[PDB]
């Protein structure tokens, strides 16, 4: 994801002399003894790298083909999403096929239980939603989106929705079970992650948001509570409860207080930039051990967010602070992720200079942290929750509201 | 210190989404 042509200010079909002339022009501009502004040095190097590729016919051809490969990969990803989105899977299991073992986690809307498939012995994580509660909390459209979207996406860091079904009382979403627990509990116990450790997680979220956004999807509930650690130490994003397909802007006030972008708080029509703001909060909390805006009452949290005055621990690197100033940018029109160069302003930021983006995508990087275990059903990486009886009424509830589920 | 203030604060536990 480097834009060599744009770096030199060129069109894709530029000639060799145009490439030479553009490199020379751009070079003079950032030359170390005629430009001593911050990061001019880093641009002087980027212009040289772009020239070395484009000025060599073999390497330029490789780069041009790679641009075509990426476009074709995106076309297949859009195809796969649209086919699944336009004709959603339904009714792919039912309740008494699963032995319910233990509650793994709860949220504002649902209960997630470790279950075991009676026939195969395989373990899964089943999210249970009470239809009447969903209606009361005004989450009908959100819950319909959640299921429809999660089973239509496919990415290495997105949890898989394996089965779904419904009965008189409840909605059920049966996911792959991610056994290493929430990032949240590890982060709180450990205190904070070192910058390379935080960067490892951050890079997975960057690729995941690049993927979702390329399908016109926004996620809207990034937080360590919704991030699970798998057996290889990689991230699995769960909780698509606020995921939505948006071309243009959307208007719902939703999210989790510490992670709300300012434009959501100010009731503005907002877009994919809110996900990039949330990434700033996540990276800050991962590396500091506490979020950039906190207070006892969410009203006071919201007042801090929209001022967006932010202070950094003195142990934060200069590159980390610079990245965070650009992600935690209160003006969405200036926020990294939302500029002309899109996700590349982030991927090519200095703080990510050591990140091998293709190796992260391929899961070839050794994780900084591997969760401990003691068996295929061990749950000790999760807190304990009070257990509650799953009751199914003899009368169907909210039949019309959830017809498409 | 700020981390000290945070771990002695009221919002160190899991944060559920807003239902508003
Ligand atoms: N696939 C999974 N594997 C293991 N545990 C999971 C999985 N999905 C969710 N959990 C656990 O269940 C918890 C609640 O699930 P989820 O966040 O989807 O519920 P919610 O009601 O939508 O919460 P929120 O208040 O964040 O909107 C998660 O925080 C996590 O601990
Ligand atoms: Zn397909
Ligand atoms: Zn198992
Ligand atoms: Zn997975
Ligand atoms: Zn660490
Ligand atoms: Zn959640
Ligand atoms: Zn949720
Ligand atoms: Zn409520
Ligand atoms: Zn309440
Ligand atoms: Zn309330």
Q: CATH number for the domain including A11? A: 1.10.287.110
- DSSP summary character for residue A35: -
Domain shared by A168 and A245, yes or no: no
Domain shared by A139 and A203, yes or no: no
By residue range, what is the domain housing residue A267? 181-371
Residue with tokens 């509570």: A225
Nearest to residue A240, comparing CAs of A259, A227, A258? A227
Q: Max Cα separation, chain A?
A: 81
Burial class (CB in 10 A: 0-12, 13-18, 19+), A113: buried
- Does the active-site annotation cover A221? yes
Compare CB distances from B3 to A256, A288, A311 and report the shortest one's residue.
A288
Domain shared by A38 and A173, yes or no: no
- DSSP summary character for residue A158: B
Neighbours of A38 (CB within 10 A): 8
Asked if the Cβ–Cβ distance from A294 to B9 is below 8 Å, we say: yes
Chain A: give the shortest CA distance to residue B2, in Å: 8
Say how far apart CA A264 and CA A276 lie, in whole Å.
13
Domain shared by A227 and A346, yes or no: yes
Say how far apart CA A189 and CA A201 lie, in whole Å.
17
For B18, phi then psi, to 5°, come to: -65, 140
Say how far apart CA A191 and CA A385 lie, in whole Å.
23
Q: Which of A221, A239, A275, A345 is catalytic?
A: A221
Residue with tokens 């769960």: A238
Letter string b/e over residues A307-330, b meaning 16 or more CB atoms within 10 A of that residue's CB: ebebebbeebeeebeebbebbbbb
What are the angstrom distances between the C-alpha of A72 and each of A67, A83, A147, A227, A263? Answer: 9, 17, 27, 30, 34
CB B13 within 8 A of CB A182: no
Compare CB distances from A290 to B6, B14, B17 and report the shortest one's residue.
B6
Asked if the structure places residue A73 within a domain, the reply is no
Method: X-ray
For A237, phi then psi, to 5°, come to: -75, 130
Domain shared by A266 and A355, yes or no: yes
- DSSP summary character for residue A250: B
The resolution in angstroms reads 1.9
Asked if the structure places residue A337 within a domain, the reply is yes
Domain shared by A123 and A230, yes or no: no
For A315, phi then psi, to 5°, come to: -80, -10
- DSSP summary character for residue A371: -
Say how far apart CA A333 and CA A278 lie, in whole Å.
15
Nearest to residue A134, comparing CAs of A161, A170, A105, A178? A170
Asked if the structure places residue A74 within a domain, the reply is no
Asked if the structure places residue A76 within a domain, the reply is no
Nearest to residue A143, comparing CAs of A281, A239, A13? A239
Chain A: give the shortest CA distance to residue B13, in Å: 9
Query: Which residues does a chain break follow in chain B (C to N more than 2.5 Å)?
Result: none
**Chain A neighbors of B8, CB-CB under 8 A:** none
**Rg, chain B, Cα only:** 11
Neighbours of A226 (CB within 10 A): 25
Residue with tokens 């006071």: A300
Domain shared by A185 and A333, yes or no: yes
Domain count, chain A: 3
Say how far apart CA A323 and CA A73 lie, in whole Å.
29
């Amino acid at each position: 994801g480097k834009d060599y042509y744009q770096t030199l200010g060129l069109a894709r079909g530029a000639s060799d002399e145009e490439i030479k002339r553009a490199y020379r022009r751009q070079a003079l501009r950032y030359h170390p003894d005629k430009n001593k502004e911050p990061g001019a040095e880093e641009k002087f190097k980027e212009i040289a790298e772009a020239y070395d590729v484009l000025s060599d016919p073999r390497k330029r051809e490789i780069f041009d083909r790679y641009g075509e490969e990426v476009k074709e990969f995106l076309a297949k990803a859009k195809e796969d999403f649209l086919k699944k989105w336009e004709s959603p899977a339904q009714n792919t299991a039912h309740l008494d096929q699963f032995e319910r073992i233990k509650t793994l986690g709860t949220g504002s809307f649902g209960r997630v239980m470790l279950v075991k498939h009676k026939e195969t012995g395989n373990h899964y994580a089943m999210k249970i939603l009470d239809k009447q509660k969903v209606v009361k909390l005004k989450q009908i459209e959100h819950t319909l989106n959640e299921k429809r979207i999660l089973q239509a996406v496919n990415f290495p860091f997105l949890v898989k929705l394996e089965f779904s079904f419904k009965d008189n009382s409840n909605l059920y979403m049966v996911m792959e079970y991610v056994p290493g627990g929430e990032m949240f509990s590890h982060l709180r116990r450990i205190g904070r992650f070192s910058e390379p450790h935080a960067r490892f997680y951050a890079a997975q979220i960057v690729l995941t948001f690049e993927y979702l956004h390329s399908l016109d999807l926004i996620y809207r509930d990034l937080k360590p509570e919704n991030l699970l650690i798998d057996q290889q130490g990689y991230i699995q994003v769960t909780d698509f409860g606020f995921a939505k397909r948006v071309k243009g802007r959307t208007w719902t006030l939703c999210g989790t207080p510490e992670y709300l972008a300012p434009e959501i708080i100010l009731s503005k029509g907002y877009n994919k930039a809110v996900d990039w703001w949330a990434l700033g909060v996540l990276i800050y909390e991962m590396a500091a051990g506490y979020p950039p805006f906190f207070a006892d009452q969410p009203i006071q949290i919201y007042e801090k967010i929209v001022s967006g005055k932010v202070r950094f621990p003195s142990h934060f690197s200069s590159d980390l602070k610079d990245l965070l100033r650009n992600l935690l940018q209160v003006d969405l029109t200036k926020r990294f992720g939302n500029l002309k160069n899109g996700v590349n302003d982030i991927k090519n930021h200095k703080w990510f200079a050591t990140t091998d983006w293709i190796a992260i995508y391929q899961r070839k990087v050794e994780a900084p942290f591997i969760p401990k275990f003691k068996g295929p059903g061990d749950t000790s990486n999760f807190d304990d929750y009070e257990e509650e009886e799953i009751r199914v009424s003899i009368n169907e509830k909210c039949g019309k509201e959830f017809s498409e589920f | 210190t700020t981390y000290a203030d945070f771990i002695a604060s009221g919002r160190t536990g899991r944060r559920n989404a807003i239902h508003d």
